[PDB]
């Protein structure tokens, strides 16, 4: 099974998942000098009021907060998108110290962590089916920048003791994912992929320009998770970020510019 270790990490993924060297891999560095304006782009529309969070799960690579996606209760529209996209889950990536951990980077600048809010195109019947299509998924990426303690985030971090090891899950109702958004939805967008195996090239990326905050003390909580299952030898979730991949023949577009 793949991981982030020296012997199963990002550098090795291409063996079991050759699409790792595909034409549209994520994440990427966003060079702000090379970002294009596009009048076809629209403001991002997030409709999360009716969202109902189900549970929080440790899957051995990160942790996920799952949402009810059986109806249009938490949907993403416009931005670069056509149609309706349902929120299925969010999860995080982070690094071993505060100076690194984001997957996307801006002019090479790394944030301490990154939040990925994962959505699927209701044109397909479900998440799994959508993931197999180039227009199937839309992921909103949000940077976590070290500074002030974040009370919204803290609610998530308060649950982590319950899911320390791989396979553990806990009830996590009434979490508003809109509480993990910044107050400006300016974005960069490009066509890409999942940043974890199977690295499917089915994601329209929407990376928010403006980060949310996280304290250094809060960041300590992320790294107390275990990659390993209960009973197995301890391996701390110190880092789980894929590095920047080549942009190749893609163009990053910016809204409002
Ligand atoms: Zn992710």
Numbering used by the authors: 4 to 260
Article, verbatim:
A well-studied carbonic anhydrase II was selected for rational design as it has efficient CO2 hydration activity and could be heterologously expressed in Escherichia coli. Thus, to better understand the key factors controlling halophilicity in enzymes and to develop a halotolerant biocatalyst for hypersaline conditions, we undertook rational enzyme design by selecting just one of several mechanisms present in halophilic enzymes: increasing the incidence of acidic residues on the enzyme surface. Herein, we describe for the first time the successful redesign of a mesohalophile enzyme to an extremely halotolerant orthologue, that is, one that is active at 3 M NaCl and above, by altering 18 surface residues. In contrast to suggestions that large differences in accessible solvent area, non-polar surface area or absence of large hydrophobic amino acids are the important features that allow halophilic enzymes to function optimally in high-salt environments, we have found that increasing the number and distribution of surface acidic groups alone is sufficient to impart this characteristic.
The conversion from mesohalophile to extreme halotolerant enzyme is conducted in stages to assess the effects of substitutions on overall protein stability and degree of halotolerance. Crystal structures of WT and engineered enzymes were obtained to confirm the presence of changed residues, that active site residue positioning was unaffected and also to compare the overall structural similarity of the designed proteins with that of WT. The structures of the four engineered enzymes superposed almost perfectly with the WT enzyme (maximum root mean square deviation (RMSD)=0.42 Å for M4) with no significant differences apparent in their secondary structures. Some of the orientations of other surface residues of M1–M4 were also altered compared with the WT, although none, with the exception of N62D, were in the vicinity of the active site.
